[PDB]
Structure formats: structure tokens, C-alpha cells
Amino acid sequence: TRDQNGTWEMESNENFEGYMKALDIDFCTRKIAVRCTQTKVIDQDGDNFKDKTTSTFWWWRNYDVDFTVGVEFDEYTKSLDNRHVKALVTWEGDVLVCVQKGEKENRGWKKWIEGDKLYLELTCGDQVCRQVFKKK
Amino acid sequence: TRDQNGTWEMESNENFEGYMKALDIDFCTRKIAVRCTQTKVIDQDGDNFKDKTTSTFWWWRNYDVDFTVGVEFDEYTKSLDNRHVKALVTWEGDVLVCVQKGEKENRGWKKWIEGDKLYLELTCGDQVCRQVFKKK
């Protein structure tokens, strides 16, 4: 039967990776694509077809650190590089400052509040990453 | 203010990738990481901190094509390899068959109903991908 109208949800997906490799799609895109749901909405009007396909992938991770200022603790950077560091958090004025002692030199972060904005500076080697958060 | 309690939503994120590269995080992980939302939940009691960072990643892609059976059309395969092909869709029996003429040899797909299910075969070169959909 030729009636393909409706909304369709993919149930099985065989050798998507090999077909995508044949299209020369990069490894990173392929890793996500094989994990996507796929929804195909097909509208047929005589010889006219509209085919709307949605691919979606949702991922989430929590990274929890509990510490007391001045009490060195061991941190395992599970959300980044998977390293063990000895972290020490101190105050410098209203700035929370952390040295992460380990394999990487000059590794740490700084965290402070101005009104409804939280600023976070992450340091490793010669690289500084600056992040701004708003209050929710 | 030294009171960092609350829920904070990242609104700006500068040089996250250079910082992650210094941490030797692989390309791709970095590419995924920089596309993440970041939420920071801080439960603070004096010098005692609980810090939860929630990273969510939401990959979403829509691909919509309109075509007429037998009428060649220009396709820009933006949901996969971002290539331009001359696509022609025909009926072969009850199978909807498409040939995508372009850089890639033996590129196309086939679409048909068996029982309750939509079947889709994607071919490129010697690679065939088979997808089965249920009706929703």
C-alpha cells in the first residue's frame, strides 16, 4: 500500500553509522546522530509529498562538589578531564578562590557575586575561561 | 556579597573551548560541552558549600522536503552531509524510490509500507541503512 500519511516514530535503526560514514559525516556528528530519536511526519496530496523529519537527542549531567572553605579536599573532575586534584578554597575579599593542585599547572577557579550576576573564572595553564551566570 | 545561595543560569561563556583544550579534553567532547546549558545550584551555610552544576545538551534538527513524484528537485541535505543533489522520486511498485544524483555514487533511498510499519532504506555506495517506524 502506497498510503504513507501520518506521524511515524523510528523503532529500529540498522547500520546508520556505516551509511553516515559513506556520506563522510564527521565522527562527532555521527556519535550524536545514531543516538537521536527520529520522527517523520508525512503529508501526501496526490503526487505531492511533504516529509518533515525531526531528529532529537537530550543529554544531562550533574556535577556535585561539597566543601568547606579552608578544608582541602580531593576532587575528581568527572565533568571535565577526569583528573584527581587537591582543591583548596579560600576567600579573597568577597571572591571565592580555589587552587586545584595536580598534574596541570596554574589550575583553579574564582567565583564571586555582583547583584544578580555570578562570575566564574576557570584557569588552566595559559587559558582563562570566563563565565557569567544570572540569578533564576 | 558573600552569600552565593540560589540557582544561577549561565548567560555568557568565553573561551570555554581553550580552557578545555588545556585540560586535554578531546575535540568533540569540547564541541558538545560548549553547546551545553549550565545551571549552578548553590546551597551555602557560612563557609560550607554544596555546589551542583547541571549541564544539559539538547540536539535538535528538523529536515523538511517538498517534492512531486516524477519531478526532479534540488535537495540540500542539511540534516546529514550538507550536499546539493538532484533528487528524483518515483514509484516502483508500491515502493517510493528516490535517486539523489550528485558527488556520491549510488546515493538514494526507498520508502514503503509493510503491514503497520513504514520502512526506509538509505543507500550510499555499498552502505545500506534500514530504519523501521511505527505509526503514532
UniProtKB/Swiss-Prot annotation, chains A, B:
* Pfam families attached to this UniProt entry: Lipocalin (PF00061)
Name its GO BP terms in alphabetical order.
epidermis development; fatty acid transport; vitamin A metabolic process
GO terms, molecular function: fatty acid binding; molecular carrier activity; retinal binding; retinoid binding; retinol binding
Expression by tissue, per the entry, reads: Higher expression in adult small intestine and to a much lesser extent in fetal kidney.
In terms of Gene3D superfamilies, this protein maps to: 2.40.128.20
Q: Which domain of life is it from?
A: Eukaryota
Record keyword Cytoplasm present? yes
Keywords associated with the record: Cytoplasm, Retinol-binding, Transport, Vitamin A
Places the protein is found: Cytoplasm
Which terms in the GO cellular component ontology are assigned? cytosol; nucleus
- Residues reported in the UniProt entry to bind all-trans-retinol: 40, 111
Q: Which InterPro entries does UniProt cross-reference here? A: Calycin, Fatty_acid-bd, ILBP, Lipocln_cytosolic_FA-bd_dom
Comment, domains: Forms a beta-barrel structure that accommodates hydrophobic ligands in its interior.
Q: Which family does it belong to?
A: Belongs to the calycin superfamily. Fatty-acid binding protein (FABP) family.
- What role does this protein play? Intracellular transport of retinol.
What is the protein name stated in its UniProt record? Retinol-binding protein 2
What is the organism field in this record?
A: Homo sapiens (Human)
- Name of the encoding gene: RBP2
